[PDB]
Every structure is written in C-alpha cells, then in structure tokens.
Design a protein around this ligand. Sequence first.
Ligand code: CL
Ligand code: XE
Ligand code: XE
Ligand code: XE
Length: 162
Amino acid sequence: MNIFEMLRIDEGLRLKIYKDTEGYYTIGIGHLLTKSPSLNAAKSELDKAIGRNTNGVITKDEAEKLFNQDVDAAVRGILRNAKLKPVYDSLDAVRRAAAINMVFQMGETGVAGFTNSLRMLQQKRWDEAAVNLAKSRWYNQTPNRAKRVITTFRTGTWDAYK
Ligand SMILES: [Cl-]
Ligand SMILES: [Xe]
Ligand SMILES: [Xe]
Ligand SMILES: [Xe]
C-alpha cells in the first residue's frame, strides 16, 4: 500500500465527467474540474487540463496523468504551508499518507483549519487526535472514508485499507 493506491481506493476512477459527493463536476481519480454548475464550464476546464477537445471523456492514461500531478501538488502544498509542514515532518510514513489524503480531498486551507487535531497529531496523542478528527463536517458527510483515514492516523498501519 502507498498513497496512490490509497487514494485510488478512496476516489475510484471514472473516465467521463461526473459529480462528486458535493455535486461538483469531476473526472478521473477525483480530479475536480470546477465548482460551477455549468457542464460547459466543466468541459472547458477539462479540455484545458488535458490539452485536447475531449468531449467530456478521457483515457485511463490521461486520468492517471492528472492523478500524478494532483498528488504531487498536494505534497507540495503541505510542504509550503507553515501550519502543515511541521506536523507532516513529524509523522511516520504511513501517517503522512493519511495527511496527504486529507489535503487531496479538502485542500490545504481546509486541513490547516483542524488546529486542535494537528497539534494532537504533532504530539503523538493518536486516540485523542482520532476523536477530535471525527468532530467535523468531513466525518459527517463522508463517514466511511473519514473512518479509514482516521484509523490510519490512529494506528500508523494500512489495516483499514486491507
Ligand atoms: Cl465515505
Ligand atoms: Xe499535516
Ligand atoms: Xe494534517
Ligand atoms: Xe489534520
């Protein structure tokens, strides 16, 4: 197990434009295209992202390409954020994958908003972090996923993904 396999399980793979759990236009392995309700706006951003007129459909390699850029970008954003980097650097490998999953799903600002869990994580107070993490809209809206990531930070193992 690694970050790519983990997110691939959490996000799935769809080759045609689809609406995510929040109703926003997405494609591939959770690649958000736009928050606009407009499918044309979506198609436009897709074509711009892939570099060709896709007509709202992409290939598996194109989906994987977007995914590689998206993971890279998530990592880079954590490293650049002064509130996230110190926590991230203090963690072990497995738990860093959990931090990446969260940033991929909710963004750097979103995660950086969990001040209390971030400190608990930095202190290596696992069960406590796990409890605080669940006190969130994220957990109430996507409980199954939130539970897998939480258990990952709780345990430092990939058991929830097995
Ligand atoms: Cl879920
Ligand atoms: Xe983090
Ligand atoms: Xe985090
Ligand atoms: Xe977090």
